Design a binder for this molecule. Structure first.
Ligand code: ZN
Ligand code: ZN
Lengths: 92, 56, 56, 186, 144, 100, 49, 118
DNA sequence: CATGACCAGAGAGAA
DNA sequence: TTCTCTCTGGTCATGAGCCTCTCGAT
RNA sequence: AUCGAGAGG
């Protein structure tokens, strides 16, 4: 139904992706101090939107809790180590 | 505390506007061609200097 | 990144994390920070062998 | 599709950035020396200097690129018909021309086509390669980034098995042929 | 209501869909399925035929359509029978099916033939598990 | 620096200029070859002032170079110095005049 | 060569999204260099959006 | 510079000096064609170049989503619909001036204040 | 991978 | 003409952290 | 043994 599209790296040269659908909301102050700081997009001619930014990660780092709060080599380290953790690898 | 983080983010803002000014000045062909470096080099040096100053 | 317009020499466009680890990095800050951390890891991984050979 | 052999065509711009007599030559798969581009072009049937430049330069108002091309027009001024262009070829006489004719459609730009009679497509494509070469040499386009992911390919299970299967299936085929020859009468 | 724009929460709905349809190894299965369905035949037909000549005639042998079975095993002093994964693991067997090609021999102016066994990627289309149920799998000693 | 001539930037800048290598290519904008066959009257209107002030006391092909104001300011370089160095290179094997 | 590439590009994209062009085929219109590149390759990494 | 080719051969012409009348002619060297020169300029060699700083302006440019939009008005028509970009020259000492393209009248203007060329 | 000496060539001065 | 002189691309060629483990085909 | 692969500080 043409609501979603496959883009490869060559093709993403010609596009402009939003990060969250909220980027498409119009604007025209009073903010939570504790939240992180997001620069306004200052771009309007969007053609696509990310499904979800967290989808940039692999299977391993998708286990890391709050990886947006740690220095990146630690995320690489945990990615290497979680493959060394024990658990039920198969129910059979 | 909230006062200190207010000051921290106002500092980040002032650095952002410093670099905005640097860039508009570069875009008007109004940089000084100080000896030994391109205009773009002077610009990059100034912006990186500003942002590192902000972080510190 | 394809989320930026062309010719954008902004702080945030070219890899300035204005957020702290406490508050949290945005996706673009996350990816740029990852870009830097990888360079760190590779510098580690080969400096090790180069200094081993130097010491030898 | 077919034998996935890889040919490599180089178009080299001779001469340092401050040197003059800056010529362009091409490397072709079975000839020792680089041969100048206009000689290829005329061997592909594009004889006049203007037609050649039209194949390379897609704007007549680009005097810079045409000025860069002038030394190539001077380089192959000696060769001004198609047949003599085909003759200029490094072999150990008529067979020389035939070897060149074959190479041009066989090993030169094999991905365009390997069937005969499409010298025009290969001439235009060679010109396109030359155009982007000169675009880079005029500090108009930047060096090509070899680490763009889009220019990268991931051979998965399918392709790997296919590459292995082609090799061994032809070994089985050669064995079949040898058993056939051995049995001339039984 | 129905046409209102989505929010960031709604994104996960789509994500769920994406995985319901593909799982987590889609690259492997799509590559192998494409190989089996199309690429195999192509390579069988590439340069296949061979011709030998004599004084009078010429004899030609040409391979045609390929057929790939479901995984089986040939038991020494025994029948060939359907090989399922767990058996192939426990018995140090190779979970692979058979290649049969329609080869003809023409002469101037044979039926299906065996040519070998291709290892099958589990959960590909020629794998028994591709159409299996959760209960089917448990009955097959295969973790779901 | 020479002992005692430290802390005067101007001496230092004079050493910088004396020491940093300079080519013609550094200051040249464009290089042209014209057909200008009557020496006393050029076909380039701009140059008439030039050929006009050559009233004191070859080959019809003209080589004409244009030089960069800013590059000439970044070095302490005169049109006279450039021209004298060209004339010294070629030993009256080539006739040189220049703008002011 | 193609003149009026905007029309052709709209047609191609609507075909791919309809399904009439394989959704894994990629299509890039480089406007400022007057190029259109289509890839039906095997082995290039893509992601949904 | 401009360049000229013989009308019969479509081969490029070579300059010749008519020494008698001090004329500039352009000769073909595949045949005997010759013709008057239309400019005294034979060779131009730019080292500081501006050619190709505006490269890539086509009427379709306004539909490049990749390109950013300024709030400036057109000097000609005063539409505030414009695309902009830095110089397309990939020399590393290139002025960081931004060229604007009006999306209403296809007119290129510039953020430069030190010069007003073309 | 990638940084680099050895000939072997050939252009190149002197008496 | 001889002779000594520079004097550079195709080469072939080197190593390339230490252990340490475990595994897995021939 | 040999070749290779993964991993650890
Ligand atoms: Zn002619
Ligand atoms: Zn306008």
């Amino acid at each position: 139904e043409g609501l979603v599209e496959y883009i490869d790296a060559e093709e993403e040269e010609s596009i402009l992706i939003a990060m969250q659908p909220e980027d498409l909301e119009p604007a025209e102050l009073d903010v939570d101090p504790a939240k992180r700081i997001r620069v306004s997009h200052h771009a309007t001619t969007f053609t696509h939107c990310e499904i979800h930014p967290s989808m940039i990660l692999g299977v391993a780092a998708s286990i890391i809790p709050f990886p947006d709060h740690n220095q990146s080599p630690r995320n690489t380290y945990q990615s290497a180590m979680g493959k060394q953790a024990m658990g039920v690898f198969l129910t059979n | 505390d909230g006062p200190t983080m207010r000051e921290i983010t106002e500092t980040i803002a002032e650095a952002k506007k410093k670099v905005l000014d640097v860039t508009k000045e570069a875009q008007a062909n109004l940089l000084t061609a100080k000896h030994g470096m391109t205009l773009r080099e002077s610009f990059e040096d100034n912006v990186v200097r500003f942002l590192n100053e902000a972080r510190d | 990144l394809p989320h930026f317009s062309k010719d954008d020499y902004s702080p945030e466009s070219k890899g300035f994390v204005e957020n702290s680890y406490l508050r949290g990095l945005t996706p673009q800050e996350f990816f740029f920070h990852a870009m830097g951390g990888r360079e760190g890891l590779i510098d580690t991984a080969v400096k090790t062998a180069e200094t081993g050979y130097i010491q030898r | 599709k077919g034998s996935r052999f890889i040919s490599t065509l180089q178009v080299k711009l001779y001469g340092r950035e401050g040197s003059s007599a800056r010529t362009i030559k091409a490397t072709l798969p079975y000839i020792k020396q680089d041969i100048p581009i206009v000689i290829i072009f005329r061997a592909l049937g594009i004889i006049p200097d203007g037609e050649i430049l039209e194949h390379i330069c897609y704007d007549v108002n680009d005097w810079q690129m045409l000025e860069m091309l002038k030394p190539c027009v001077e380089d192959g001024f000696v060769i001004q018909d198609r047949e003599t262009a085909l003759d200029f070829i490094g072999r150990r006489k008529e067979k020389r021309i035939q070897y060149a004719k074959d190479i041009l459609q066989k090993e030169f730009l094999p991905h365009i086509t390997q069937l005969e009679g499409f010298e025009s497509r290969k001439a235009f494509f060679l010109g396109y390669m030359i155009n982007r070469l000169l675009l880079c040499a005029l500090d108009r386009k930047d060096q090509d980034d070899r680490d763009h992911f889009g220019k990268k390919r991931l051979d998965l299970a399918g392709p790997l098995l296919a590459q292995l299967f082609k090799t061994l299936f032809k070994k089985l085929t050669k064995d079949i042929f040898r058993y056939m020859q051995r049995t001339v009468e039984e | 209501d129905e046409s209102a724009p989505i929010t960031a929460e709604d994104s996960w709905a789509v994500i769920s869909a994406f995985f319901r349809e593909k799982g987590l190894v889609s690259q492997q299965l799509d590559s192998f399925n494409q190989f089996v369905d199309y690429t195999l035949q192509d390579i069988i037909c590439e340069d296949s035929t061979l011709i030998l000549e004599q004084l009078a005639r010429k004899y030609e042998i040409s391979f045609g359509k390929i057929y790939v079975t479901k995984p089986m095993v040939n038991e020494s002093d025994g029948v060939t029978h359907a090989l399922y994964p767990q058996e192939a693991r426990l018995r140090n067997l190779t979970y692979s099916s058979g290649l049969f090609v329609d080869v003809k021999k023409r002469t101037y102016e044979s039926g299906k033939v065996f040519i070998g066994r291709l290892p099958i990627m589990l959960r590909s289309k020629n794998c028994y598990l591709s159409e299996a149920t959760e209960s089917d799998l448990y009955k097959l000693k295969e973790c779901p | 620096l020479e002992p005692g001539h430290a802390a005067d930037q101007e001496q230092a800048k004079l050493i910088r200029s004396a020491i940093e290598h300079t080519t013609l290519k550094s200051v040249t904008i464009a290089s042209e070859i014209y057909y200008d066959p009557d020496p006393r009257s050029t076909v380039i209107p701009e140059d008439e002032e030039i050929i006009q002030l050559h009233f004191s006391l070859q080959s019809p092909w003209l080589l004409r170079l244009e030089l960069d104001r800013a590059a000439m300011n970044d070095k302490d370089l005169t049109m006279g110095q450039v021209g004298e160095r060209i004339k010294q290179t070629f030993k009256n094997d080539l006739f040189v005049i220049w703008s002011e | 060569v193609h003149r009026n590439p905007a029309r052709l590009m709209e047609t191609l994209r609507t075909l791919r999204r309809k399904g009439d062009i394989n959704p894994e085929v990629s299509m890039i219109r480089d406007i400022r260099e007057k190029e259109l590149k289509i890839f039906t390759d095997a082995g290039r990494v893509y992601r949904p959006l | 510079t401009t360049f000229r080719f013989c009308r019969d051969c479509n081969n490029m012409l070579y300059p010749r000096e008519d020494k008698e009348n001090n004329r500039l002619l352009f000769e073909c060297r595949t045949c005997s064609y010759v013709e008057e020169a239309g400019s005294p300029l034979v060779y131009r060699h730019e080292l500081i170049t501006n050619i190709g700083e505006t490269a890539g302006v086509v009427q379709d440019i306004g539909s490049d989503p990749t390109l950013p939009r300024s709030d400036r008005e057109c000097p000609k028509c005063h539409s505030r619909e414009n695309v902009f970009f830095q110089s397309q020259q990939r020399r590393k000492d290139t002025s960081m001036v931004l060229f604007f393209v009006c999306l209403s009248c296809s007119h290129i203007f510039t953020s430069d204040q030190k010069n007003k060329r073309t």
